[PDB]
Amino acid sequence: TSKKDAAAAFGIGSSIYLACEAIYNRAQAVIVAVGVETAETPEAQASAVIGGISAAGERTGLQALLDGKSRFNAQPRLLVAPGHSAQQAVATAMDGLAEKLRAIAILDGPNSTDEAAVAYAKNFGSKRLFMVDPGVQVWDSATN
Amino acid sequence: LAEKLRAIAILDGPNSTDEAAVAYAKNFGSKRLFMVDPGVQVWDSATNAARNAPASAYAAGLFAWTDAEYGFWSSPSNKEIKGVTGTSRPVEFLDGDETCRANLLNNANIATIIRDDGYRLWGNRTLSSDSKWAFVTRVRTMDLV
Amino acid sequence: SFFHGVTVTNVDIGARTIALPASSVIGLCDVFTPGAQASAKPNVPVLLTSKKDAAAAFGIGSSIYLACEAIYNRAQAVIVAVGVETAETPEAQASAVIGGISAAGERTGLQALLDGKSRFNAQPRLLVAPGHSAQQAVATAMDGLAEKLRAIAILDGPNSTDEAAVAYAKNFGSKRLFMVDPGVQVWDSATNAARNAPASAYAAGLFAWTDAEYGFWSSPSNKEIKGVTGTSRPVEFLDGDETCRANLLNNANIATIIRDDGYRLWGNRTLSSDSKWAFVTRVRTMDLVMDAILAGHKWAVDRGITKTYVKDVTEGLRAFMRDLKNQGAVINFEVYADPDLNSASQLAQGKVYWNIRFTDVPPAENPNFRVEVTDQWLTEVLD
Amino acid sequence: DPDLNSASQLAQGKVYWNIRFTDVPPAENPNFRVEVTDQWLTEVLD
Amino acid sequence: MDAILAGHKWAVDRGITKTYVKDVTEGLRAFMRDLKNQGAVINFEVYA
Amino acid sequence: SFFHGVTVTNVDIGARTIALPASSVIGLCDVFTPGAQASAKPNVPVLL
Amino acid sequence: TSKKDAAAAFGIGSSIYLACEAIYNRAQAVIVAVGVETAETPEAQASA
């Protein structure tokens, strides 16, 4: 529920705290953040964000957002996986998850040319998908 | 078994070209048979890559979704298939051309997956030799009333 | 108990909204010399949206940048430009402009404009091959291409005498062919002199300017051409002579560029054999309301023919033509589901028929005035 | 059932009824027949 | 006959809408009315 | 299923307009002297 | 009836849970799943 709460939970400087910093600098919001461990390859990173169900019988990746109402009484309405939603597999997993929550899954296309943005937006056809193409250039406090 | 339970058996042919799928659907000349030929390409968590799904359980998810939102009297084609990152042997349907290989597959009473990176179904036809029962809406509603 | 609890449903039975597909995308295919200053491969389509982007893709001074400079100095349009390489013989130069398909199944020449919607979401409506449309081989393959895109393939005849243009326009007889005969004499800043332009891209910018200024239902046949300095082989239109040299080319379905300093387009007729599809306004408005309906009713492909389905397609089709009628595009209309075709057998096969009759706005190419003197009111100066 | 409910079968004690219904067909081919006429051109006079 | 011929060269490809014939006629009635109260004509009748 | 999809067809059943071909085009044939100042050939037609 | 019960009954990595994940990602339905063991010969896996 605050910017200091995200740095206390996920550590300051992580790639999900940098998304909570992006939200709390503009609005005063309430985030149900999942947080996954950093996988080795960018292929196996998409396994972590999509997730599924663990061997212990528990949802892991984006699927754990369905516990937002049963555990916090906060059902999410904006589904954001920043950076990983540019992959076709994660954006389709968040496509059907946005109908299990009646949420608006805010996608973001690839940061390449505009031809590769219309070719990416021609894959979805779903009414609960909002796509923001151009990559924002923001100041990094780590690498200055 | 579909005549016993009054169900609709959702089939799927091989992942070869259309010449091998039309020749497979000619064996079936009865209703309660729904053919979805082109294989859905889905992402696998084990190999961390794409996997050719048989695309028989994705039409079943589309059949079970349209009965919740629209109803059992509604055809599940022109509705979005979700969880799909593409189609093995991608089917062409450009604007309205009858020369496309999508309409050359629907004329064998075979539902297809047509859009760019495969995001909807295409076809209402069952594999029936009767002109009356050549609709998956009429077979689903007669067997339910 | 089918369900024990609250059932909140979204019925989704309303009428939809039909929009127009922007009517102003220009297909271009002209030669250029590829290298380090040109960032375009010599057969792929490039989406040029500005004058600086046409120079960064094809290079300054190329024969296709000079056609993009012709459009962007008159209008502000979207150019889907292909670009090709120079052939050694002009007999085999027409084969590179037409193209066809490659060894890898990729369309190369003018056929690459069919990828304009699948790649850039911009389907071209003006098919312009400047300089190469004077050959009959390119223009026959551009008319057949204009039936694939529902476009108006803008031609330009040879810059010889007027009989060479009448004999060139006799071959076609197609309603998607708009021909501008006299070659524009334009300033060339590469040689610091005045060259002769093929006068096809200058009429392309006139079509794309009136769509942004007066609408897609408006003929460009009275509007100014900006970039020119004159006209090669000047044609004559004096005041009101129906036997002028300019009017005899419009009578042979050929548009012209008439006045001193060459600043008017004159002619709104296609090369149509039928007198129905003569005006380029009626051909343009028909392809725009046949493509808005086709690409706007992709929601209604398996919705189920109920009584409220046909009633909410028609009332969403009536509102499309009504929003065109007060806009000025059509005069009146009559949208109605056909009772004589929507039988109980045709509905059972999944076939529903709708009729959209309408009248377009014809361009007033000949306003007559019948002036007379009389002595009817002569006894009115009496009190 | 009009052709089966006979007086000779009423004594058997077995009357017949028919349940017919017309199912909603999916609109798999929504044709549009759009034409350009010159009927309302005289409407442009006042 | 030359004021009308050289003064209506804007209306060569405007398109026949209801406001076109309205504003050519009512732009032509004002030309003859400005001739009537100037003294050139006595009366007029301009109509499509 | 002979076609699955939207079918927009222009039926093209209007009544066509007929125009008058040419009021006065004058065919001429009289003698002349071909040479330097005369740009015509002594048998081909010349549109004047 | 849910994705948890389809993974509790058959386990992840099973070919029938991959079918149940295909249904529950799109709809929310009741699945009567049988589940069989893998046969060696594919000529008799259809008989299984």
Q: How far is CA G7 from CA A51, C25, F1, G3, in A?
A: 13, 53, 40, 6
**CA angle (D41 as vertex; D40, D45 as ends), nearest 5:** 110
Neighboring chain B residues of D23 at a CB cutoff of 8 Å:
73, 135, 137-138, 141-142
Mutate to test the interface with D, among E14, E18, E25 (most CBs of D within 10 A): E18
The tokens for B84 are 């799909």
The string of DSSP letters for C110-145 reads GGGGGGHHHHHS---SEEE-TTTTTSHHHHHHHHHH
Side chain identity, residue C103 = A
Say whether D32 sits in a helix, a strand or coil. Answer: strand
**Residue C240 phi, psi (nearest 5):** -145, 20
Between CA C332 and CA C320 the distance in angstroms is 12
Residue-wise DSSP of A129-143:
EEE--SPP----TTT
What CA–CA distance (Å, rounded) separates C346 from C351? 5
Chain B CB contacts of F8 under 8 Å are 96
What Rg, from alpha-carbon coordinates, does chain E have? 12
Across the strands, what pairs with B85? none
What are B52-57's contacts with CB under 8 Å, separation 24+?
B52/B15, B52/B88, B53/B84, B53/G18, B53/G22, B54/B12, B55/B12, B55/B87, B55/B113, B56/B10, B56/B11, B56/B12, B56/G19, B57/G19, B57/G20, B57/G22, B57/G23
Report which of E15, E12, D37, D38 is spatially closest to residue C327, judged by C-alpha positions.
Answer: E15
The whole-angstrom separation of Cα B20 and Cα B36 is: 13
Q: CA C326, CA C328: separation in Å to the nearest integer?
A: 5
Contact of C153 with C139, CB cutoff 8 Å:
yes
Distance from CA of residue B105 to its chain's centroid?
Answer: 11
Query: Does B42 reach chain G within 8 Å, measured CB to CB?
Result: yes
Name the token pair of C147: 């039936």
CB-CB neighbors (< 8 A) of B84 in chain A: 92
**C275:F17 CB<8 A:** yes
List the structure tokens of A48: 């972590």
* DSSP one-letter string for F1-48: ----S-EEEE---PPPP-----S-----------SSS--S-SSS----
Distance of CA C372 to the CA centre of its chain: 41
Interface check for E48 against chain C (CB to CB < 8 A): the answer is no
Q: Does B51 touch chain A (CB under 8 A)?
A: no
Q: In terms of DSSP H, where are the helices of C10-132? A: 51-58, 65-72, 90-98, 116-120
Rounded-to-integer distance, Cα C303 and Cα C14, Å: 12
Select from B118, A24, E20, A118 the least CA-distant residue to C116: A118
Burial profile F6-39: b = 16 or more Cβ within 10 angstroms, e = fewer: bbbeeeeebeeeeeeeeeeeeeeeeeeeeeeeee
CB neighbour burial string for C234-268, b if at least 16 within 10 angstroms, e if fewer: bbebeeeeeebbbbbbbbbbbbbbbeeebebbbbb
Which two three-digit tokens encode residue G22? 């295909």
Enter the resolution in angstroms: 3.5
Q: Which of C122, C155, C121 is nearest to C141 (CA)?
A: C155
Distances (CA, A) of C221 to A20, B86, C53, C229, C255: 58, 48, 29, 19, 8
**Mutual angle of helices B57-69 and G17-24, in 10-degree steps:** 30
Angstrom CA distances, A138 to A22, A130, C87, E37, stand at 10, 21, 49, 73
Which residue matches tokens 């309408």? Answer: C358
CA A127 – CA A108 distance, rounded (Å):
15
Gap between the Cα atoms of C365 and B68, Å rounded: 59
Token pair, residue A127, equals 């009414």
* Residue of chain A minimizing CA distance to G17: A53
D45 touches chain C (CB under 8 A): no
Q: Identify the DSSP state of C65.
A: H
Residues of A in contact with G4 (CB under 8 A): 53, 57, 59
Q: Which of A99, A113, A118 to mutate to test the interface with C (most CBs of C within 10 A)?
A: A118
**Residue C230 to residue C349: CA distance in whole angstroms:** 61
A104-107 and A129-131 beta bridge pairing: parallel
- Which strands make up the sheet holding C193-197, listed edge to edge? C193-197, C184-188, C228-231
Q: Does C365 touch chain E (CB under 8 A)?
A: yes
Q: Contact, C176 vs C95, CB < 8 A? A: no
Report the distance separating Cα A92 and Cα A114, nearest Å: 21
Instruction: For chain B, list the contacting chains (3+ Cβ pairs, <8 Å).
Output: A, C, D, F, G
Contact check, Cβ <8 Å, C289/D34: yes
Residue C195's H or E segment, with its range, is: strand C193-197
Whether residue D23 and residue B142 make contact (CB cut-off 8 A), yes or no, is yes
Whether C275 has its CB under 8 Å from any CB of chain F: the answer is yes
Is there a contact between C95 and C87 (Cβ–Cβ < 8 Å)?
yes
Token pair 């050719």: residue: B52
Contacts of C114 (CB under 8 A, 6+ apart): C107, C145, C148, C149
CA-to-CA distance for C377 and C211, rounded, in angstroms? Answer: 47
| Residue C244 to residue C258: CA distance in whole angstroms | 11
- Establish how many alpha carbons lie within 13 A of residue F10's alpha carbon, considering only the half-sphere containing its beta carbon: 17
Question: Which of chain C's residues have a Cβ under 8 Å away from the Cβ of E8?
Answer: 367, 369
Task: Report the residue from F4, F12, F16 with minimal CB separation from C275.
Answer: F16
Give the Cα separation of C75 and F19 in Å (integer): 35
Residues of F in contact with C294 (CB under 8 A): 6, 8
Inter-chain touch C119–A114, beta carbons under 8 Å? no
Contact call for residues C271 and B72 (beta carbons, < 8 A): no
Closest Cα of chain C to E30: distance in Å?
15
CA distance C133 to C155: 5
H helix runs in chain G, sequence order: 3-10, 17-24, 42-45
Q: Which residue is closest to F9 within chain C, CA to CA?
A: C290
Instruction: Note whether B74 contacts C304, CB cutoff 8 Å.
Output: yes
Collapsed DSSP state (helix, strand, coil) of residue C14: coil
State the best of F2, F9, F16, F17 to mutate against chain D, taking most chain D CBs within 10 Å. Answer: F9
Mutation target among C302, C306, C347, C349 for the B interface, most CBs of B within 10 A: C302
Distance CA E14, CA C239 (A): 18
Question: How far apart (Å, rounded) are the C-alpha atoms in residues A36 and D43?
Answer: 69
Q: Where are the domains of chain C?
A: 20-273, 274-362
Taking each helix axis as running N to C, give the angle between helix A3-10 and helix A17-24, from 0 to 180 degrees, rounded to the nearest 10. Answer: 180
Chains G and D touch (3+ CB pairs under 8 A): no
A16 vs A138: CA distance, rounded Å: 15
Contacts of E20 in chain D (CB under 8 A): 44
In B18-105, at which residue ranges do the beta strands (DSSP E only) sit?
33-35, 41-44, 49-52
Whole-angstrom Cα distance, residue C66 to residue C83? Answer: 12
| DSSP code at position D25 | P
* Percentages (nearest 5) of helix, strand, coil residues in chain C: 30, 15, 50
Question: Using CA atoms, how far apart are residues C76 and C211, in angstroms rounded to an integer?
Answer: 10
> Chain F partners of C248 at a C-beta cutoff of 8 Å?
47
- Contact at CB, E21 and D44, closer than 8 angstroms: yes
Interchain pair C47, A119: CB under 8 A: no
Contacts of F15 in chain D (CB under 8 A): 38
Are B103 and F7 a contacting pair at CB < 8 A? Answer: no
Residues of C numbered 291-310 whose beta carbons fall under 8 angstroms of chain B's beta carbons: which are they? 294-295, 298-299, 301-304
Three-state SS at C154: strand
| Strand ranges across the sheet with C177-179 | C46-48, C78-81, C25-28, C126-128, C152-155, C177-179
Is B82–A99 a contact, with Cβ atoms under 8 angstroms apart?
Answer: yes
Kindly report the nearest CA distance between residue F5 and chain C, in angstroms.
6
Cβ(B116)–Cβ(F11) below 8 Å: no
Question: How big, in percent rounded to 5, are the helix, strand and coil portions of chain B?
Answer: 25, 15, 60
Taking the mean position of all CA atoms in its chain, how far away is CA G34?
8
B-chain CB neighbours of D25 within 8 Å are 135, 137-138
Chain C residues near residue A115 by CB distance under 8 angstroms: 47, 119-120
What tokens does C26 get?
A: 């220009």
CA-nearest of A52, B62, A99 to G3 is: A52
Assess C364–E contact: CB distance below 8 Å, yes or no: yes
Residue from B102, E43, A86 nearest F1 by CA: B102
Record the tokens describing residue G30, joined without a space: 């009741």
Say which residue the tokens 């069952």 belong to: B126
For residue E19, which of C331, B140, B143, C218 has the smallest C-alpha distance?
A: C331
Q: Alpha-carbon distance E45 to C340, whole Å?
A: 49
Pairing, β B9-11 against β A104-107: unpaired
What tokens does C287 get?
A: 């392809």
The answer to whether the beta carbons of residues C383 and E30 sit under 8 Å apart is no
Measured in angstroms, the CA of B83 and the nearest CA of chain G are apart by: 6
Contacting chains of F (3 CB pairs or more, <8 Å) are B, C, D
Integer Cα distance of C176 and C41 in angstroms = 29
Cβ atoms of C68 and C48 within 8 Å: the answer is: yes
> Quick one: tokens of C290?
């046949």
Q: Could you tell me which residues are beta bridge partners of residue C336?
A: C355
Cα-based angle C334, C339, C345 (whole degrees, multiple of 5): 145
F16 touches D at CB < 8 Å:
no
The CA-to-CA distance between both ends of chain F, in Å, stands at 62
Q: How far is CA D14 from CA D2, D18, D19, in A?
A: 14, 13, 16
The answer to whether residue B137 neighbours chain C at the CB level (below 8 Å) is: yes
Contacts of B73 in chain C (CB under 8 A): 304
Mutation target to probe the F interface, by most F beta carbons within 10 A, among C275, C279, C365 is C275
Contact B69, C10 (CB under 8 A): yes
Q: Minimal CA–CA distance to C293: which of F13, F5, B94? A: F5
Sign of CA pseudo-dihedral G7, G8, G14, G16: negative
User: Residues 21 to 40 of E: which have CB under 8 A from any D CB?
Assistant: 21
Look at residue C360 and give its three-state secondary structure: strand
Q: What 3-state DSSP class applies to C209?
A: helix
- Chain A residue with the nearest C-alpha to that of B115: A123
Q: Using H for helix, E for strand and C for coil, what is the string for A21-62?
A: HHHHCCCCCCCCCCCCCCCCCHHHHHHHHHCCECCCCCECCH
Distance CA B43, CA E20 (A): 61
Contact of A102 with chain G, judged by CB distance below 8 Å, is answered with no
Q: Give the distance from residue A57's alpha carbon to the nearest chain G alpha carbon, in angstroms.
A: 6
Q: How many C-F residue pairs are in contact by the CB < 8 A criterion?
A: 27
Contact check, Cβ <8 Å, C118/B94: yes
C-alpha torsion sign, points C204, C205, C209, C214:
negative
Structural element, H or E, at residue C194: strand C193-197
| D34: Cα within 13 Å, side-chain hemisphere | 25
Touching, E vs B (3+ Cβ pairs under 8 A)? no
Three-state secondary-structure class, residue G43:
helix
